[PDB]
Design a protein around this ligand. Structure first.
Ligand SMILES: *[C@@H]1O[C@H](CO)[C@@H](O)[C@H](O)[C@H]1NC(C)=O
Ligand SMILES: *[C@@H]1O[C@H](CO)[C@@H](O)[C@H](O)[C@H]1NC(C)=O
Lengths: 49, 60, 261, 105, 105, 48, 53, 105, 49, 60
């Protein structure tokens, strides 16, 4: 007459605080850049979008 | 402030009903404390106040 | 925030190089953990102003006590679990008249570069009713009858000496920038330099190309801010923040950068 | 068991008897032995080379060596581009992950 | 207890445990007559990020070929080489080498 | 260089060796004290 | 009776890697490996000395 | 790998690895493990057990240093450099000495 | 077989050593700057950078 | 036998100015001798006279 209930499922782990991966949507970007002008013996380097 | 509950008394989750080291005087009330305040990390501070505490026989 | 150490004013010319000195032998660490939990306890014996102190017994962290004289085996005893509670007491099984003198219990931590020591004067008598333990004003003096044991107490229950965490790997130096008119606590982070090697640079590209710290900073203990090609817009309140949270070191140096001669 | 943390011992239950043994009796292999590094409570953090099962072994108070054995394909996650030997004196620095050596989470 | 006239198959002693407790795993079942009943203290040893000394690769030798390249590689272990074009498309290819090979691209 | 036969002396008792082994001495990283280099292709192992 | 290491002008010791990930300080640091013996045995050169006091 | 392990004076064993891949260059037309009984002639070469090997250079030189600032006791702004049967070079970047080499504290 | 002969390195403490040209087969020398030495009791040099 | 020269005395190579127990008396003369005279096999007989010296403790 001995029977036995068995139940299980799945959940998250403690790995998910660091180990994960982002599925992600990417569209139009920010054209950022840097240029150095040697204006008259003066190397001036700037960085902007 | 966080307040625990053994279904009749609302002792705080930093004041146990068998203060302190509640197991080594009575086990089953600590078991009911577990089954009641499983939802509380303040109860994990209460077990901190029931396991990593200074009882009447030890000064740790 | 931090404990400040030196506050100075620096006035320099536009187009020059600023050097904001921030150096520390006690923040030196390397990209390896080569005995970075290495501690040592040792007991030394001295005999007055005209004698030289002598090492009796030592013990490395996570190790067993080492005796230096074969005569002293099973005679000088330390607690093998000294590093669990900070109980570094030394038991001398049987004392004699030659054992009088000052014994020093020395703790040294190679990672924080900490050293702490305590002295005890041993005086060996012949009568047990004269045997006492008293405090002479600056050290414990133990009076023990000849042939009796002497337990010289060395108890330091601070967490830094016992095998608690001390796996921090979070020496960190911050270079901060406080622009004019903006009050503190909302100060802008400029640079994060972590002991593990990881670096964080902040700001637009215009700033990152001119602000740097030498690449072997933790190897040489040099965290000095170098500002090449000083501009008037570069002036402001810069701050070096050294943080060792486990050993409780919180130091800052503050530099008021002015653009003048 | 006395609300203390004596690092010399343990417990193990055998036929209504919770019996204790020595801390330092712990010897683990996959097919090759491993490194005993982090030992507290349930948990053994251990570095171990390649194998195909796992066997942890220890000895009793009557010097009865017992071993748990599970057939499990153990392999490391390959880190970096190399399939290398081990860590050398001269390499570079790549981020990875390790079970932390904290006392109580 | 004294029980009148029941043999060893007819009797069953089962020492119910409510003080002495050697913990185990939730793959082994619960009480035979109980539903939900919990006891909750955390587990130690979290995981943290770290950065390790991976090896650096072994520098091989190169020279020109007629709008080509001759490259003799010496590996110490099998490692991936790869190559790509920096134009409108990569056409990138990836291979492993185990022993010392001349590869021409 | 690096081929089996880079190491070249005239007689087996002659020690005047012409060889090209390409030791480009690397920088030891940070605080560690050793002498890393560009690795030496040993022809005499794979002679066999 | 081949008292071979009395004249060993010293290096006060260190090990670059004892294993364990990080470094250490011991004269168990081997300096070189001799392997070319065609029988397959190995001659290894540790920095400590054995046998002779 | 290679792994050579010694033991401390307090009976503390410590391993030592250096990254080296051992290969056996197998000899002749037999590809096996170890010397059997039914064997045949093979001219091999090995290091003889004689100690008197003739004039092999190992570089030994001047001791670099042993920086021992552990015995430098801070006597409230005073650095008592304890020597303890040694010959300590001290570089005191202060008053009361600039440099020197002592045998007494 | 050859021998890659590595002599003992030459740490010029608080100073910049210069190249000793030695007529050796595949001779190679370099003085690295900004090093840090260490030993048993911390740093092998009192020198800093 | 053959004569080792320390730029002042052309002594016999197995007969230094420190007969017997060369290194065992002091290490620094052996240090200087390894510093200058390393080019000589007669100095390696002197190295024997520092290594396999057979001093007063040895029976030979
Ligand atoms: C300016 O930069 C160029 C590279 O863009 C460099 O070759 C040159 O030496 C620099 N001259 C000055 C005066 O900075
Ligand atoms: C400290 O160590 C000594 C060693 O003999 C021991 O007798 C003493 O009880 C220890 N103290 C405590 C508080 O455990």
């Amino acid at each position: 007459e001995n029977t036995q209930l068995s139940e299980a499922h799945v959940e998250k782990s403690e790995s998910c605080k660091t180990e994960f991966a982002s599925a992600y949507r990417a569209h139009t970007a920010s054209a950022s850049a840097k240029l150095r002008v040697l204006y008259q013996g003066n190397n001036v380097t700037v960085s902007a979008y | 402030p966080v307040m625990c509950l053994l279904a009749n008394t609302t002792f705080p989750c930093s004041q146990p009903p068998c203060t302190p080291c509640c197991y080594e005087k009575e086990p089953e009330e600590t078991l009911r404390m577990l089954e009641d305040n499983v939802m509380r990390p303040g109860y994990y501070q209460l077990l901190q106040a029931s396991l990593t505490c200074s009882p009447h026989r030890q000064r740790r | 925030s931090s404990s400040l150490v030196s506050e100075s004013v620096v006035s320099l010319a536009a187009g020059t190089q600023a050097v904001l000195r921030c150096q520390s032998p006690r923040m030196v660490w390397t990209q390896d953990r080569l005995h970075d939990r290495q501690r040592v306890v040792h007991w030394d014996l001295s005999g007055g102003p005209g004698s030289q102190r002598r090492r009796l017994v030592d013990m490395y962290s996570a190790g067993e006590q080492r005796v230096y004289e074969p005569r002293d085996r099973d005679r000088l005893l330390l607690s093998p679990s000294a590093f669990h509670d900070g109980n570094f007491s030394l038991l001398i099984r049987a004392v004699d008249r030659g054992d009088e003198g000052v014994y020093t219990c020395n703790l040294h931590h190679h990672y924080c570069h900490l050293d702490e020591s305590l002295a005890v004067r041993l005086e060996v008598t012949e009568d047990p009713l004269l045997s006492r333990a008293y405090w002479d004003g600056e050290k414990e003096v133990l009076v023990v009858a000849h042939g009796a044991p002497a337990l010289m107490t060395c108890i330091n229950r601070a967490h830094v000496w016992t095998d608690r965490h001390l796996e921090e790997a979070q020496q960190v130096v911050h270079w901060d920038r406080q622009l004019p008119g903006v009050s503190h606590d909302r100060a802008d982070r400029l640079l994060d330099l972590y002991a593990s090697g990881e670096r964080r640079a902040y700001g637009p590209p215009f700033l990152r190309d001119r602000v740097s710290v030498n690449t072997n900073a933790f190897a040489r203990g040099d965290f000095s801010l170098r500002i090449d090609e000083l501009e008037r817009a570069d002036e402001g309140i810069y701050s070096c923040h050294l943080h060792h949270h486990y050993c409780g070191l919180h130091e800052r140096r503050v530099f008021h950068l002015q653009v003048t001669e | 068991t006395d609300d203390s943390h004596d690092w010399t011992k343990l417990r193990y239950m055998d036929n209504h008897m919770p019996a204790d043994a020595e801390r330092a009796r712990l010897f683990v292999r996959t097919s090759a032995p491993c490194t005993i590094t982090g030992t507290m409570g349930h948990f053994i953090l251990a570095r171990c080379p390649k194998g195909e099962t796992l066997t942890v072994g220890f000895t009793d108070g009557r010097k009865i060596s017992h071993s748990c054995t599970h057939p499990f394909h153990h392999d490391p996650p390959v880190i970096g581009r190399e399939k290398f030997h081990s860590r050398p004196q001269h390499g570079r620095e790549l981020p990875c992950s390790t079970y932390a050596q904290s006392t109580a989470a | 207890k004294v029980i009148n006239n029941c043999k060893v198959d007819q009797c069953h002693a089962a020492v119910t445990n409510h003080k002495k407790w050697q913990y185990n795993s939730p793959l082994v079942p619960r009480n035979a007559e109980l539903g939900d009943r919990k006891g909750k203290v955390h587990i130690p040893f979290p995981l943290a990020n770290v950065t390790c000394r991976v090896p650096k690769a072994r520098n091989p030798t190169v020279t020109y070929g007629k709008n080509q390249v001759i490259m003799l590689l010496y590996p110490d272990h099998p490692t991936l080489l790869s190559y790509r074009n920096m134009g409108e498309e990569p056409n990138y290819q990836e291979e492993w080498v185990t022993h010392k090979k001349e590869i021409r691209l | 260089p690096g081929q089996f036969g880079d190491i070249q002396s005239r007689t087996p008792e002659s020690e005047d060796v012409y060889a090209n082994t390409q030791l480009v001495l690397q920088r030891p990283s940070a605080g560690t004290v050793h002498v890393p280099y560009s690795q030496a292709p040993s022809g005499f192992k794979y002679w066999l | 009776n081949f008292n071979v290491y009395k004249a060993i002008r010293p290096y006060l010791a260190h090990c670059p890697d004892c294993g364990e990930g990080h470094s250490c300080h011991s004269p168990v640091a081997l300096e070189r490996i001799r392997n070319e013996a065609t029988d397959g045995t190995l001659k290894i050169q540790v920095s400590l000395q054995i046998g002779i006091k | 790998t290679l792994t050579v392990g010694f033991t401390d004076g307090r009976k503390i064993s410590h391993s030592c690895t250096h990254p080296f891949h051992h290969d056996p260059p197998v000899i002749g037309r037999e590809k096996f493990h170890s010397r059997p009984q039914h064997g045949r002639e093979l001219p091999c070469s090995t290091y003889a057990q004689s100690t008197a090997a003739t004039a092999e250079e190992i570089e030994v030189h001047m001791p670099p240093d042993t920086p021992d600032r552990t015995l430098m006791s801070q006597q409230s702004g005073n650095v008592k450099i304890t020597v303890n049967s040694q010959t300590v070079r001290y570089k005191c970047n202060c008053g009361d000495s600039n440099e020197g080499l002592t045998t007494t504290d | 077989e050859y021998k890659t002969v590595i002599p003992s390195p030459y740490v010029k403490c608080c100073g910049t050593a210069e190249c000793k040209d030695k007529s050796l087969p595949d001779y190679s020398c370099k003085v690295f700057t900004g090093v840090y030495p260490f030993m048993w009791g911390g740093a092998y040099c009192f020198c800093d950078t």
